[PDB]
Design a protein around this nucleic acid. Sequence first.
RNA 1: GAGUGAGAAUGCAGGCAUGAGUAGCGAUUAGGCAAGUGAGAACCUUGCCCGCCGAAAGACCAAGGGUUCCUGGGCCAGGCCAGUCCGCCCAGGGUGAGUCGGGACCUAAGGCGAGGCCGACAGGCGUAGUCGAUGGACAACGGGUUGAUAUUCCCGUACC
Lengths: 114, 54, 97, 46, 118
Amino acid sequence: EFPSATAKARYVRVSATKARRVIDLVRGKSVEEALDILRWAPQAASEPVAKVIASAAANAQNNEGLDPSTLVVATVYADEGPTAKRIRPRAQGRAFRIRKRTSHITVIVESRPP
Amino acid sequence: AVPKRRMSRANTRSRRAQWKAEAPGLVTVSVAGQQRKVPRRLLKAARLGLVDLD
Amino acid sequence: ATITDPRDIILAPVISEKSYGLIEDNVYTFVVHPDSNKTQIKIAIEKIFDVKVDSVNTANRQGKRKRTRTGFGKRKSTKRAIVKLAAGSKPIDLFGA
Amino acid sequence: AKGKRTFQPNNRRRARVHGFRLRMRTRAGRAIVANRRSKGRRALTA
Amino acid sequence: PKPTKGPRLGGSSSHQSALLANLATSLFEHGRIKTTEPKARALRPYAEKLITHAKKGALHNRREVMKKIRDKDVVHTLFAEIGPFYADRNGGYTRIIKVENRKGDNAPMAVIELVREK
RNA sequence: GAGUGAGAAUGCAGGCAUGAGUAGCGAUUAGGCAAGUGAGAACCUUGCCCGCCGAAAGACCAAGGGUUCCUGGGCCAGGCCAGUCCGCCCAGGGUGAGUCGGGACCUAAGGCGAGGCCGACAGGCGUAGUCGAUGGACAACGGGUUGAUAUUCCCGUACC
Ligand SMILES: [Mg+2]
Ligand SMILES: [Mg+2]
Ligand SMILES: [Mg+2]
Ligand SMILES: [Mg+2]
Ligand SMILES: [Mg+2]
Ligand SMILES: [Mg+2]
Ligand SMILES: [Mg+2]
Ligand SMILES: [Mg+2]
Ligand SMILES: [Mg+2]
Ligand SMILES: [Mg+2]
Ligand SMILES: [Mg+2]
Ligand SMILES: [Mg+2]
Ligand SMILES: [Mg+2]
Ligand SMILES: [Mg+2]
Ligand SMILES: [Mg+2]
Ligand SMILES: [Mg+2]
Ligand SMILES: [Mg+2]
Ligand SMILES: [Mg+2]
Ligand SMILES: [Mg+2]
Ligand SMILES: [Mg+2]
Ligand SMILES: [Mg+2]
Ligand SMILES: [Mg+2]
Ligand SMILES: [Mg+2]
Ligand SMILES: [Mg+2]
Ligand SMILES: [Mg+2]
Ligand SMILES: [Mg+2]
Ligand SMILES: [Mg+2]
Ligand SMILES: [Mg+2]
Ligand SMILES: [Mg+2]
């Protein structure tokens, strides 16, 4: 087994599959390429994911004293969370519901020697 | 028209999996003594000093 | 039993930036029980502070309605009174600036 | 272009018409107030 | 110049006329502005036509530039410090450089400015 | 001894799916640029043009609502988007009348009603009266004020 550190941000106001779109672009890459891709991918979900990756890198560098140049993303995944419930008026006075979705984000980082 | 039956796991996920994004390449430029990263659209602009990067 | 005294009415003075904009102009602000009247408050202030006042203006401020998880909350209704002393101009040191 | 709706409020109509005194003026209204009081409503009358 | 091929930028002929006049005036007043990249693409012909008119100073060109862009201040500065300053340069008066995409709607912005090399 | 065995009754209540990141984002007016705050700015703030209403899409009142008014703080929840902004939420402040609107004045349509009449009963009528404005009698202007209030506060002059 190899040393690893984890960091997550729950209750983030993005859709699960919509954040997973961006998340699929970072699996298995090094942290530097990850930061570059998240900076240069024009998506709203790019901000929370990049923040989570940056926080995880900070935790790995501080708590365990690992060298950031050798860290790589081991597994990253988003799971749907509690959904805020709302109501919307529609035509003919008849009413439909709006499901305000919320997602979880999990990032664990692994340090792999070259 | 409306659907009359639930489209299955395989159909839904197979259709959805094609919708993705593509990661682009980056360009290193030597400006002001620092090497910073732009897309190739901005290589000349970076060397001359006409593009703003935070 | 109970006898009639004029200074069973005043609740408090009120401190505010407008209250100071009035304190500079020899006009004062007091908090007064709702069932009062300008004549009663005039007699009260004259007797208590030995100053001869000209006229008193009164206003009612409806209570606000403050949010709380327990439920719908409403504060109490208050009556403010505006008083203006005469040209004699005797400051009330009990106001405490 | 008619769109004027049913409920056109007036607190003066409301109070003189569904008021406590209009209730108490007739015996049926007293019966209604007693029934409501037995039930335990917070607002007895409109 | 060649008209915009598709449905027009702002949504009508009068609207784009006013929009383009305002962009040209603000750009000539200031020197360097940041705007939508296709907007700068469509801006290029108008500012270049103004530079063409400016190159040859005369009363008819005074009135032509006035009827185009509606500001005595900007036309005066255009005829006084921009005009003669491009006397020896034939074409190529504006530079388009795009920048980080917008946060509001991810529209590509480009920084368009006069050439001040000479 | 049983409220004792569900898979269905267009069953009931709770939760979660696909249709799907698809349609729509609420008009006949339209913006762009600069500087400023801010971690983030088309959407907020300030400046210049452009656009639209202008018998209104401006300014006041009544009915109606009740703090949405102003100031300061913050932006997970609400605004069909981010939002430093908000009619969001937290705290504080703000409504000053002998003369403006009602009561101490009076009545219309109509309501209540002592006695009284009628009605098995509960009740229904209406006299003297008393209620009931959408009516009538009866007393103001100019200017100034701070960050929010002005025919109310102050100055000046009057009224009944
Ligand atoms: Mg971004
Ligand atoms: Mg008074
Ligand atoms: Mg509340
Ligand atoms: Mg049973
Ligand atoms: Mg079951
Ligand atoms: Mg069933
Ligand atoms: Mg059905
Ligand atoms: Mg579905
Ligand atoms: Mg479609
Ligand atoms: Mg559409
Ligand atoms: Mg709408
Ligand atoms: Mg901006
Ligand atoms: Mg018009
Ligand atoms: Mg009209
Ligand atoms: Mg007119
Ligand atoms: Mg009203
Ligand atoms: Mg009211
Ligand atoms: Mg406000
Ligand atoms: Mg605040
Ligand atoms: Mg917020
Ligand atoms: Mg919401
Ligand atoms: Mg608040
Ligand atoms: Mg009667
Ligand atoms: Mg009787
Ligand atoms: Mg009678
Ligand atoms: Mg009456
Ligand atoms: Mg009346
Ligand atoms: Mg007012
Ligand atoms: Mg006034």
